């Protein structure tokens, strides 16, 4: 598990 | 459609 980031616009640990 | 850009570390339109 770690950090992640979505760029989609929308911009956000799992 | 939308880009979509992903990071998670590793880092990529629908």
Request: without cysteine; charged residues 25%.
């Amino acid at each position: 598990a770690s950090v992640q980031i979505v760029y989609k616009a929308e911009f956000x640990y799992k």
